[PDB]
Write an enzyme that holds these catalytic residues in place. Sequence first.
Site, PDB file in Angstrom:
ATOM      1  N   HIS A 153      64.359  19.918 -10.423  1.00 18.88           N
ATOM      2  CA  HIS A 153      63.024  20.378 -10.880  1.00 18.88           C
ATOM      3  C   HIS A 153      63.024  20.760 -12.377  1.00 18.88           C
ATOM      4  CE1 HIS A 153      61.388  21.388  -6.598  1.00 18.88           C
ATOM      5  NE2 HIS A 153      61.617  20.091  -6.764  1.00 18.88           N
ATOM      6  N   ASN A 201      57.024  23.209  -6.604  1.00 21.66           N
ATOM      7  CA  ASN A 201      57.518  21.853  -6.852  1.00 21.66           C
ATOM      8  C   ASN A 201      56.627  21.264  -7.977  1.00 21.66           C
ATOM      9  OD1 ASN A 201      56.987  22.539  -3.892  1.00 21.66           O
ATOM     10  ND2 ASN A 201      58.888  21.254  -3.696  1.00 21.66           N
TER      11      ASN A 201
HETATM   12  C1  LIG Z   1      65.287  13.294  -5.554  1.00 19.68           C
HETATM   13  C2  LIG Z   1      64.265  14.201  -4.978  1.00 19.68           C
HETATM   14  C3  LIG Z   1      63.241  14.495  -5.797  1.00 19.68           C
HETATM   15  C4  LIG Z   1      62.253  15.362  -5.365  1.00 19.68           C
HETATM   16  C5  LIG Z   1      62.388  15.916  -4.114  1.00 19.68           C
HETATM   17  C6  LIG Z   1      63.546  15.709  -3.291  1.00 19.68           C
HETATM   18  C7  LIG Z   1      64.485  14.829  -3.762  1.00 19.68           C
HETATM   19  C8  LIG Z   1      65.750  14.655  -3.014  1.00 19.68           C
HETATM   20  N1  LIG Z   1      61.381  16.582  -3.555  1.00 19.68           N
HETATM   21  C9  LIG Z   1      60.257  16.886  -4.285  1.00 19.68           C
HETATM   22  C10 LIG Z   1      59.047  17.425  -3.769  1.00 19.68           C
HETATM   23  O1  LIG Z   1      58.979  17.688  -2.555  1.00 19.68           O
HETATM   24  N2  LIG Z   1      57.970  17.731  -4.587  1.00 19.68           N
HETATM   25  C11 LIG Z   1      58.032  17.439  -5.903  1.00 19.68           C
HETATM   26  O2  LIG Z   1      57.073  17.756  -6.620  1.00 19.68           O
HETATM   27  N3  LIG Z   1      59.133  16.917  -6.440  1.00 19.68           N
HETATM   28  C12 LIG Z   1      60.215  16.578  -5.654  1.00 19.68           C
HETATM   29  N4  LIG Z   1      61.188  15.773  -6.172  1.00 19.68           N
HETATM   30  C13 LIG Z   1      61.185  15.412  -7.611  1.00 19.68           C
HETATM   31  C14 LIG Z   1      60.158  14.303  -7.951  1.00 19.68           C
HETATM   32  O3  LIG Z   1      60.673  13.168  -7.273  1.00 19.68           O
HETATM   33  C15 LIG Z   1      60.025  14.073  -9.447  1.00 19.68           C
HETATM   34  O4  LIG Z   1      59.587  15.270 -10.090  1.00 19.68           O
HETATM   35  C16 LIG Z   1      59.097  12.897  -9.863  1.00 19.68           C
HETATM   36  O5  LIG Z   1      59.610  11.706  -9.285  1.00 19.68           O
HETATM   37  C17 LIG Z   1      59.228  12.700 -11.412  1.00 19.68           C
HETATM   38  O6  LIG Z   1      58.324  11.636 -11.734  1.00 19.68           O
HETATM   39  P1  LIG Z   1      58.537  10.908 -13.099  1.00 19.68           P
HETATM   40  O7  LIG Z   1      57.646   9.725 -12.960  1.00 19.68           O
HETATM   41  O8  LIG Z   1      58.320  11.789 -14.315  1.00 19.68           O
HETATM   42  O9  LIG Z   1      60.059  10.469 -13.192  1.00 19.68           O
HETATM   43  P2  LIG Z   1      61.051   9.628 -12.187  1.00 19.68           P
HETATM   44  O10 LIG Z   1      60.535   9.600 -10.778  1.00 19.68           O
HETATM   45  O11 LIG Z   1      62.401  10.169 -12.430  1.00 19.68           O
HETATM   46  O12 LIG Z   1      60.844   8.157 -12.730  1.00 19.68           O
HETATM   47  C18 LIG Z   1      61.441   7.873 -13.999  1.00 19.68           C
HETATM   48  C19 LIG Z   1      61.694   6.398 -14.158  1.00 19.68           C
HETATM   49  O13 LIG Z   1      62.021   6.033 -15.438  1.00 19.68           O
HETATM   50  C20 LIG Z   1      63.117   5.138 -15.412  1.00 19.68           C
HETATM   51  N5  LIG Z   1      63.839   5.082 -16.600  1.00 19.68           N
HETATM   52  C21 LIG Z   1      64.700   6.091 -16.859  1.00 19.68           C
HETATM   53  N6  LIG Z   1      65.228   5.827 -18.042  1.00 19.68           N
HETATM   54  C22 LIG Z   1      64.650   4.647 -18.548  1.00 19.68           C
HETATM   55  C23 LIG Z   1      64.822   3.898 -19.757  1.00 19.68           C
HETATM   56  N7  LIG Z   1      65.584   4.240 -20.814  1.00 19.68           N
HETATM   57  N8  LIG Z   1      64.091   2.743 -19.863  1.00 19.68           N
HETATM   58  C24 LIG Z   1      63.276   2.338 -18.858  1.00 19.68           C
HETATM   59  N9  LIG Z   1      63.012   3.061 -17.697  1.00 19.68           N
HETATM   60  C25 LIG Z   1      63.761   4.194 -17.594  1.00 19.68           C
HETATM   61  C26 LIG Z   1      63.728   5.191 -14.059  1.00 19.68           C
HETATM   62  O14 LIG Z   1      64.479   4.129 -13.533  1.00 19.68           O
HETATM   63  C27 LIG Z   1      62.653   5.770 -13.226  1.00 19.68           C
HETATM   64  O15 LIG Z   1      62.290   5.035 -12.138  1.00 19.68           O
END
Ligand SMILES: *Cc1cc2c(cc1C)nc1c(=O)[nH]c(=O)nc-1n2C[C@H](O)[C@H](O)[C@H](O)COP(=O)(O)OP(=O)(O)OC[C@H]1O[C@@H](n2cnc3c(N)ncnc32)[C@H](O)[C@@H]1O
Lengths: 104, 52, 575, 575
Positions: free
Chosen positions: C505, C550
Amino acid sequence: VDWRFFGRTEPKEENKLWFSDKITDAYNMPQPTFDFRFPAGRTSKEAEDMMTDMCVMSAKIGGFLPGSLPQFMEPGLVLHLGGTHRMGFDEKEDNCCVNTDSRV
Amino acid sequence: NVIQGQLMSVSVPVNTLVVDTLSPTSWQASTFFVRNGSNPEQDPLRNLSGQA
Amino acid sequence: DIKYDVVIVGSGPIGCTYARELVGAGYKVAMFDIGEIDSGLKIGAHKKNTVEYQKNIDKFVNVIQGQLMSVSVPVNTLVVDTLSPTSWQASTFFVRNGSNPEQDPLRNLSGQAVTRVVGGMSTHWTCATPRFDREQRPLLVKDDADADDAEWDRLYTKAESYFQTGTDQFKESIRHNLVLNKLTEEYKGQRDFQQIPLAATRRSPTFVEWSSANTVFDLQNRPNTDAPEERFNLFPAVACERVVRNALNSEIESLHIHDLISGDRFEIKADVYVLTAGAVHNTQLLVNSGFGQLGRPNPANPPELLPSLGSYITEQSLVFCQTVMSTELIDSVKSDMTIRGTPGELTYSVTYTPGASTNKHPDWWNEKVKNHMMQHQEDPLPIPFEDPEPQVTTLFQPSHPWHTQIHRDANSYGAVQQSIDSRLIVDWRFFGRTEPKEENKLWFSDKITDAYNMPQPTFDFRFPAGRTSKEAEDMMTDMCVMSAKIGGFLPGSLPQFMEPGLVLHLGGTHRMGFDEKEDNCCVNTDSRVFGFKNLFLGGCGNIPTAYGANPTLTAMSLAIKSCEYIKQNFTPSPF
Amino acid sequence: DIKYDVVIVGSGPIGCTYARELVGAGYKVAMFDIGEIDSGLKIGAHKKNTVEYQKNIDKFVNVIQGQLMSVSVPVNTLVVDTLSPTSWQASTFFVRNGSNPEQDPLRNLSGQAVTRVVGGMSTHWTCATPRFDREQRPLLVKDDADADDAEWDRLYTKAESYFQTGTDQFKESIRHNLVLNKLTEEYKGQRDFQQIPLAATRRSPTFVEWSSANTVFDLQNRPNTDAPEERFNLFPAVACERVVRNALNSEIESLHIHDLISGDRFEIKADVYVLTAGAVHNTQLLVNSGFGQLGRPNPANPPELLPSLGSYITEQSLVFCQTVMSTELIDSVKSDMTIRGTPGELTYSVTYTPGASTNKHPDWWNEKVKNHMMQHQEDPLPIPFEDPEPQVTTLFQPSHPWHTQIHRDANSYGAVQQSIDSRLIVDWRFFGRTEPKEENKLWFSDKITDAYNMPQPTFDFRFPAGRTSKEAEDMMTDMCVMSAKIGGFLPGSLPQFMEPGLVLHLGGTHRMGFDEKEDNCCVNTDSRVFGFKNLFLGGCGNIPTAYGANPTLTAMSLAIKSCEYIKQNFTPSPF
Ligand SMILES: *Cc1cc2c(cc1C)nc1c(=O)[nH]c(=O)nc-1n2C[C@H](O)[C@H](O)[C@H](O)COP(=O)(O)OP(=O)(O)OC[C@H]1O[C@@H](n2cnc3c(N)ncnc32)[C@H](O)[C@@H]1O
Ligand SMILES: *Cc1cc2c(cc1C)nc1c(=O)[nH]c(=O)nc-1n2C[C@H](O)[C@H](O)[C@H](O)COP(=O)(O)OP(=O)(O)OC[C@H]1O[C@@H](n2cnc3c(N)ncnc32)[C@H](O)[C@@H]1O
């Protein structure tokens, strides 16, 4: 810092120490057998309140040590068993084995 | 260690852990028989297992 | 192409918020993800929405673990001295197995991890989407709480629509009730208990369609039959590496990308650039682009550009345990029954009186229990086998400033915990709020590189020592006190703080405020990077407050607001 | 539709063998899988073919664990006596958490598991595809070893083509060499060492396209642009539940299916019915259709129909350990170098003479080592960081009748094993052959049901006591002796037998032979069920011999032969 909290157990007729008529221990004496559960009302309520009290009190001094988190220990590890040949004033009335002079 | 060395368990139920990674050549139990001084009278679920 | 109206880096739920809004408003949009399509034919969907996972739910813990790649692993100093004398044996604790020599093992978020797949972490998340109360919530309007309130209510309502948030999906659960009803009785009416708000839609008594990135935006290329006037392309397996600043630091001029399949590198031009790569990876991309400061922080040389970038980071303290339902609660399930005889015998009977008023439970409940008890006399519990799991919370309040979840996560039980009937087991997760402090940092090595040849992330973090720490320990106590109302701890799942950052988080790495200098921040309330006309950041990294709930719904709400600004300020290209 | 030429149950690599052959020959084909599409846009592909897994390979162990659902879990009898007094506590070891009360915990294959996803286990497998030597191999022609040999060579060559089997993908590995070259020196020329035959194609020095079901058949619906005259439909999330026998047990007349999304049940008519649901699930489907005998076996009532079904089951003994490379082998890497000074200092130098003949290694090797040693003076090993993993085997032979794999699987290391540099670590898996014995059975409960409401599988298995057991222990010793040539055991990965059935090489559940009665078998050498004109079984369940090599290539080869029979005996419908 170590925290040990010890609860009181209500005496209940159903909680028993008995001895096998066939199995023998290492000294060829009748094998001890337990039939025990912590009573379900007061004893159990207090035992869980006692856990909470340890959690509340200990937090005043510091957080738990990983690996030594709050837990109930294996029944009887405390080695404070009582009541197996219990004292009272009247054998029948007080469900007992010895009198107040510890005489059978 | 000195304490543990002189605490001999009062009543040890028959063991029912499943060891299924023995080598095929090793002698393997067909039942949970009375082993290692266990007490077959003892209900494992109504015990003072810690008593010694 | 090499030219789009909008480019979005990351296909998580926040990037998809941008895509939903901007694709729908007529912009020519490209989205890049470093990860690949791997949730089935619904692109970026929740991986728990298979029939097989929902029939075998504890196996899903493995899918989560499989796509959590640790951010910063210190050099290992475990002593292995039982190697055979012939085996090669180290003389020092050298850098092994991708460890980060920059990282102080004692000032880490060791639990922090990242997920690189289309849909990001929303392909595995728990789908809890509470709103933040004012105490936790960033200000969007100053000096007018009513206008601030009104803006947040609008944005949160939209975000709840996008995620399909609801509070009703578990209402016919015996276990859910058993828990909630007991707790609410015990707090003198001063702590309200409700269902956890969940981004999910129930399809049947045994199947729940959990929401994800795909719910927000389906990630299909457009134009298509269904959206013939829309323009959207998703490019997976593309590492976005650097945004190119002009000389004035007023505009981004291109995005450098690396196609990981072909190996080829390109530059992509857009009118607007949105970075939604996550709280860690947004920061990394910016630092690799000249924002902030690369290398070990040095106060004798503060960054000129975005000095607060990577400072004031927050991560929540998390405490966990499980309990085994009390005998009294289990007996309460069957309180309305008359029970005669012993199970399994000819004479055994379990009955209740339909519609009776001395009854503690309604008929739906008593029928379920009666039928379970009479049809499954081999089974000693009154709870139906397929009873849905509990989903309970008392939300953060000033008097108890932590979020709570009293529920079931997919869990990997030790063989001895598989000893306890799952119907009895309840998970407790309490989440604390962390004060933002300048000293708490995420920084990037100038020499060590990660698996994608990008500057290696390094944490310098400790939970603050006054309020944050006091609250964290009060929160542990509160979990101990509250959980005891339902049952004793499950051996093997005793009360504990989890590894820092395992909660995932993290916030505040590129934080929002009104004034860059005054509020020590990187983006404004439109999520626009200060100084830059055309660069926007989305995600939890934007959240500048101490929060325990969250964060994702809040991050989404900020992204909606940012999308409104873009709609107000950039004209889409003609189709 | 409700009518096809061919229906195939299961979209594993064996079902895809049928689809490849029959779709290509013009049949109107439907394929049903109980599982769902979840490898990306390549349907049924290997889940390890993402850039992220191949940059983070040990995380893949989690993906495997996440899709292995135990076949038969006995009732748990672990004693949890540290519950709080208030917690509900069992009085007996009752049936909990999906356990199977039929199952003797002491006569189980506890490690046996199944995978329900499009592409089956081929979405996670290790891709080893050795041929069986005659000693392990089922006869296809009797009384003519030359004709038998010729048929197997043809079929294996075709199957190697389908899977893209090769033995060259790891040839430039220092570690692979280090291991292979040492071992081959030590066995007096009497045990040949080669690369493991792998169903894979290398795309770059750091990426390998592992094969899968998708390699065999792409699973796209046809007609399509690329195959406009072909007819293929895949239906995921469909449980196939029963094939309907006629009265004579000469034909299958329909297949009952259950759509798990809609809940609806249908019947599907085909001319030919192929069951490729796996060694366990083929058997289950047949027993639920009246083949063999439902319930606990009873000799006082042998099945009339397919009496050998579910008898004579085989599973391989598996021994495992890991080693840490010897100091002598590590010094040998750098044998051709002259080394002066101490690493990190001004004067330090590492050189070799290109093309010299006193040199133990070729230039490609010495350049890699020299450059690693000079550019990474902080690193104490001479092995390049990205050196590919070892992939070594000495195949099963009469004198050592076990298969061997000396390699690296994706592994989950304890924190203390993450202490040891991965470059030093080699995995050893030796696989024994199990005699088929009538007493070794897979049977199905007449009362207990699994998660799909199908009769619960139950094992009654022990490794046979003479040859099988003698060999299994000789095989353990052989692993101990052989591995010591490379290095000592890795603490935490000491030599051990793995949980029975964790190897997932079960065979013989619906075994092949020439004569149903004489050879105690269920299918003939065309994989046709005895008596039935139109029912065929594919998979390892067909293999009736004691084998130690990995079975899938052999199962594929049998399926090719079965497809030839269908081509010879059924006319496709006009397009
Ligand atoms: C893992 C998890 C997360 C989670 C959770 C339980 C688990 C085990 N339970 C949650 C919940 O009940 N309620 C909640 O609000 N959050 C909870 N979470 C966390 C939640 O999944 C995240 O806060 C949310 O997914 C974040 O969204 P965001 O869109 O900002 O980011 P992401 O999902 O991490 O996606 C980021 C993407 O960007 C890509 N990426 C990363 N680096 C690069 C580069 N350099 N170039 C191109 N793309 C890139 C990733 O691959 C990714 O998919
Ligand atoms: C798991 C695994 C397997 C494996 C291995 C390592 C691991 C961890 N390494 C191997 C190797 O290196 N070499 C080799 O030869 N085998 C190795 N394996 C095992 C290999 O994956 C299997 O032998 C092969 O996959 C078996 O192929 P088959 O096509 O016969 O069966 P399947 O893959 O299990 O696919 C069966 C499908 O049928 C479905 N199904 C099951 N029940 C039903 C019902 N009732 N109705 C409809 N469909 C059904 C499944 O969902 C499945 O996909």
